[PDB]
């Protein structure tokens, strides 16, 4: 279930490299995701060119799990999904709360 399989999913990837590889896009709310641990919460990196200081802008999204009914992970106690492409395909639609949720997914 390591998602490796969605444009925004990254295996093995950092924070550090999901900054840099999404900026590579130059996409407006590029949105990626990488593995942790715990539970199982995957990560997701969502970067929206727009940074005067630092731009473009790569932000972290981690994927939180909540043993639901399925409900399991979610990034903001906001809404928790039984995987993050489905977490990942309510934060592309839906619109989240983020930078601009899953604006586009980014894949290295």
Same mark, same amino acid.
Request: aromatic fraction near 12%; include cysteine; charged fraction near 25%.
């Given at each position: 279930?390591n998602?490796?399989?969605?444009?925004w999913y990254?295996?093995?990837?950092?924070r550090? !490299?999901?900054?840099?590889?999404?900026?590579?896009?130059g996409?407006?709310?590029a949105?990626? %995701?990488? *593995? =942790?641990?715990?539970?199982?919460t995957?990560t997701?990196?969502?970067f929206?060119?727009?940074?005067?200081?630092?731009?473009?802008?790569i932000?972290h999204?981690?994927? !939180?799990?909540?043993?639901?009914?399925?409900?399991r992970?979610?990034?903001?106690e906001?809404? %928790?999904? *039984? =995987?993050?492409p489905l977490?990942?395909?309510?934060?592309?639609?839906?619109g989240g709360?983020?930078?601009t949720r899953?604006?586009y997914?980014?894949?290295g």
């Amino acid at each position: 279930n390591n998602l490796e399989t969605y444009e925004w999913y990254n295996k093995s990837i950092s924070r550090d !490299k999901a900054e840099k590889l999404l900026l590579d896009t130059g996409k407006e709310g590029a949105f990626m %995701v990488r *593995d =942790s641990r715990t539970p199982g919460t995957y990560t997701v990196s969502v970067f929206t060119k727009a940074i005067i200081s630092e731009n473009p802008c790569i932000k972290h999204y981690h994927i !939180k799990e909540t043993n639901d009914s399925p409900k399991r992970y979610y990034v903001a106690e906001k809404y %928790v999904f *039984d =995987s993050i492409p489905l977490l990942i395909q309510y934060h592309q639609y839906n619109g989240g709360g983020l930078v601009t949720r899953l604006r586009y997914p980014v894949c290295g």
